[PDB]
Amino acid sequence: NDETLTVYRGATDNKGNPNKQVHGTVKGVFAWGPGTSTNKFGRDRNFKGESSSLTAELYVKRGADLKARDRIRRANGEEYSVVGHAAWDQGHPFDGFDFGYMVFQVEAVN
Amino acid sequence: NDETLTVYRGATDNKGNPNKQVHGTVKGVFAWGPGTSTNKFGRDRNFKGESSSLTAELYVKRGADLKARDRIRRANGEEYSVVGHAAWDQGHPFDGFDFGYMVFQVEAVN
Amino acid sequence: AGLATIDELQTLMSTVFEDDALEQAQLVLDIVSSWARVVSGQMWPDAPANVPDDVRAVVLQASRRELKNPDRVISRQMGPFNVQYSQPPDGFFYPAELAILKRFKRSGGLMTVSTSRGEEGRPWAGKTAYIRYGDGL
Amino acid sequence: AGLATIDELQTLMSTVFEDDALEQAQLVLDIVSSWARVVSGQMWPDAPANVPDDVRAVVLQASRRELKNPDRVISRQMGPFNVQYSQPPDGFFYPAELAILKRFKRSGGLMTVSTSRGEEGRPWAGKTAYIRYGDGL
Amino acid sequence: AGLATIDELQTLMSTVFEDDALEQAQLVLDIVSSWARVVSGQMWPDAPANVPDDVRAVVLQASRRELKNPDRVISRQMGPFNVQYSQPPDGFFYPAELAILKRFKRSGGLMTVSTSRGEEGRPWAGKTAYIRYGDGL
Amino acid sequence: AGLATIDELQTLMSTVFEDDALEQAQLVLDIVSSWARVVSGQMWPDAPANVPDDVRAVVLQASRRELKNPDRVISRQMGPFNVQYSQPPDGFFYPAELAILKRFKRSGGLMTVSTSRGEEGRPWAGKTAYIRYGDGL
């Protein structure tokens, strides 16, 4: 089924010092690709060293504690960052039925 | 069904000082993706700090008070800006049937 | 006419009717009530007085279907949003609803018509020729 | 009416009904109870007293299929998420559910109608012409 | 009611039910037990005492399908993830499950109904007219 | 119950069951064994003693099908990977498995039911009226 995700919440002030603390646990699943393929891994190139860039989609239950501008840690150790408000967060325009699912474009850096 | 949207209307003069006031409420729905996927979130990169860029589509009833070069606020607090004239704002070329729907490419910044 | 009222329809649709929407809903409900009356065959003089729950349910459902889509549509989509309804009924009522409505018909519905061979009939040619031969009793 | 209550429906749907949602759910449940009553043919004077578990199951299931997916839709999708339902029944109850409701009907359901040849019948033309020739016993 | 308990259902689903999920599962299991009871025709006074393994299997499976499929869906997908189930049965039980449930019915299930020609019958018109001409033995 | 054990199922699936997976597998195997027993009609008092290889094969296969997919999924895919199974059996078994299970039934399976015309029968009305006119031999 689903797997628990550690969420870190924090708002940067004018001093530019982030203050991220534990906000609880959220249940969600990851999707490394929009369709039948997978997203390519970015190359830092300019950065001195070696790294990778990834943009995935996170599926979470409606009305979850997760919110944009937060940090997400998986069960293996990698830490991701989610940005941007949730998409498809509305009911059916014709009838009003609710799927209860939203997509988060989480950026994978580890 | 639909959700009310706050619309802000204002025309910039030669002085470059915007004057945006409340023009009323408009009913519409949001679509964060052209097809079965979702639009990627832009990165400011050059801008000092962190932000996001988004380009969505807004579906509104025909003959609404909404017009291009306006500001849109949702029910949660985020404020969007709509630019460009509405598309598909015509009847059937063969018969003349009217769908009554138009698409607005609204830019999401919050 | 008007088997059903407008308040319970509003509660069923979870919306409020105003301006021409209320008038359109009332007209549609009256049309559906007339169709139910003609299908059942009864009259219901006092419309919102007896009005059994079966016909109320039938007319409310038919009005809901009519208001949801006035033109019979199978699949309708606008951009990413898509919806595909089932097969619409030929009339305002589904066959099950029509069968429920035909309950009030007398007997099992197997009504008959009295045919004739184009004859009137005179059952007196032979009886009035008798002459009274008694005391007149 | 009201064969089923609202608490067990809330537990079945794992949600709570409030505002117009509670009223809409109550109206739907009453409609379904009326349909089940007319299909079965019984009356159930004390509605939430005897109310066998079979009819409770039927009305709860029909109320669920009415509250969720109100207008009959086969496939409904918005964006990346899609869902396709099975073929909706003609009425609020599936054909399998109708058999359970028709259980309470007398005998096997093969009720008959007494036909006639348009005749009243007078079984006394020949008996009253007898004259008492005895002691009057 | 309650042919099956909740612990073996939890083991079958490999999950634990809490909050209103336990109540919903119990209600679904009671509904399925009532349906199995009415299909089989027996009563099972002591529900979790005799409760043969066949009916336990049927009710557990039906509860599993109901919990994992509240509204009958053919294909459901959310983004890249997709799943398509088989054709749902008309009722809570598949035809094989229904046949297994109908095992407890008496004989082969070919029960009959005693018809009549609208007659009561008086098998004494001709016997009581006899006058005792003996010793009264 | 328990026609088959858990070690040979583990070898067939090439996996080891632990925690609630072992309990779920045992419950599924018990359910399948009960269904096979009721289909065949035998009892098998000592379950893992006689337990012919045919029924062991049938129960192991049914357990494997149940563990692989309990929702009877036709086609399931997540991302690039896709899989589409064949048509699932109705209850648990394909027709060949059911035919093999019904081997143990007596004769060819064409069992009959003894009907009656609602009569008890008294084969003594006429024999006990005879009076002994001999020596009592």
Q: What is the length of chain D?
A: 137
What's CA C32's distance to the chain center, in Å? 8
The experimental method behind these coordinates is: cryo-EM
Q: Quote the tokens at residue C40.
A: 């059942």
For strands B70-73 and B54-61, give the pairing: unpaired
Q: Judging by beta carbons within 10 Å of its beta carbon (0-12, 13-18, 19+), is residue F111 exposed, middle or buried? A: exposed
Spatial separation of the C-alpha atoms in residues F84 and A1, rounded to whole Å:
20
Name the DSSP letter for residue A41: P
Cross-chain CB nearest to D27 (options C12, C84, C96): C12
Long-range CB contact pairs, C108-111, < 8 A, 24+: C108/D113, C110/D113
What are the backbone angles phi and psi of residue A72, rounded to the nearest 5°?
Answer: -125, 130
**DSSP-assigned letters across all residues of C32-92:** HHHHHHHHH----SSTTTS--HHHHHHHHHHHHHHHH-SS--SEEEETTEEEEE-PPPSSS
Assign residue C50 a region (left: φ > 0; alpha: ψ between -120 and 50; beta: otherwise).
alpha
Spatial separation of the C-alpha atoms in residues C95 and E110, rounded to whole Å:
31
Name the DSSP letter for residue F133: -
Cβ–Cβ < 8 Å for A68, A7:
no
How is the beta sheet containing D81-85 ordered, strand by strand? C75-78, C81-85, D73-78, D81-85, E73-78, E81-85, F73-78, F81-84
If you count DSSP H runs as helices and E runs as strands, how many of each does chain A have, helices first? 0, 6
What are the backbone angles phi and psi of residue A20, rounded to the nearest 5°?
Answer: -105, 125
CA distances from F19 to A1, B110, D76, E5 (A): 17, 48, 39, 20
Residue in A60, A99, A103, A105 to test binding to D, most D beta-carbons within 10 Å: A99
Residue in E90, E98, E113 to test binding to D, most D beta-carbons within 10 Å: E90
Nearest CA in chain F to A31: F79
3-state SS class at E81: strand
Within 10 angstroms of residue F42's Cβ, the number of other Cβ atoms is 15
What's CA C24's distance to the chain center, in Å? 20
Q: What is the length of chain E?
A: 137
Say whether B36 and C79 touch across the interface (CB within 8 A). no
Residue in A1, A2, A36 to test binding to F, most F beta-carbons within 10 Å: A36
**For chain F, first and last CA: distance in Å?**
60
**DSSP-assigned letters across all residues of E35-96:** HHHHHH----SSTTTS--HHHHHHHHHHHHHHHH-SS-EEEEEETTEEEEE-PPPSSSS-HH
Touching pair C, E by Cβ (3+ pairs < 8 Å): no
Within 10 angstroms of residue D131's Cβ, the number of other Cβ atoms is 5
Overall resolution, Å? 3.8
Q: What is the length of chain C?
A: 137
Q: Which residues of F touch A39 (CB under 8 A)?
A: none
Cβ–Cβ < 8 Å for F69, E64:
no
Q: Where are the beta strands (DSSP E) in A1-110?
A: 3-9, 21-31, 54-61, 70-73, 79-82, 101-108
User: Which helix H or strand E contains D81, and what residues bound it?
Assistant: strand D81-85
Name the DSSP letter for residue A21: E
User: Which helix H or strand E contains B73, and what residues bound it?
Assistant: strand B70-73
Within 10 angstroms of residue A80's Cβ, the number of other Cβ atoms is 20
C-alpha torsion E85→E91→E97→E100, nearest 10: -170
Cα C110–Cα D111–Cα D42 angle in degrees, nearest 5: 110
Spatial separation of the C-alpha atoms in residues A2 and A4, rounded to whole Å:
7
Within 10 angstroms of residue F89's Cβ, the number of other Cβ atoms is 17
Spatial separation of the C-alpha atoms in residues E31 and E37, rounded to whole Å:
10
Say whether B52 and A83 touch across the interface (CB within 8 A). yes
If you count DSSP H runs as helices and E runs as strands, how many of each does chain B have, helices first? 0, 6
* Rg from Cα positions in chain F: 26
Q: Quote the tokens at residue D78.
A: 């918005």
Q: Quote the tokens at residue E26.
A: 């119990």
Nearest to E33 by CA among E66, E78, E63, E69: E63
For strands B70-73 and B3-9, give the pairing: antiparallel
Spatial separation of the C-alpha atoms in residues F9 and F15, rounded to whole Å:
9
User: Which helix H or strand E contains B55, and what residues bound it?
Assistant: strand B54-61
Q: Quote the tokens at residue B89.
A: 């704002």
Q: Which residues of F touch E111 (CB under 8 A)?
A: none
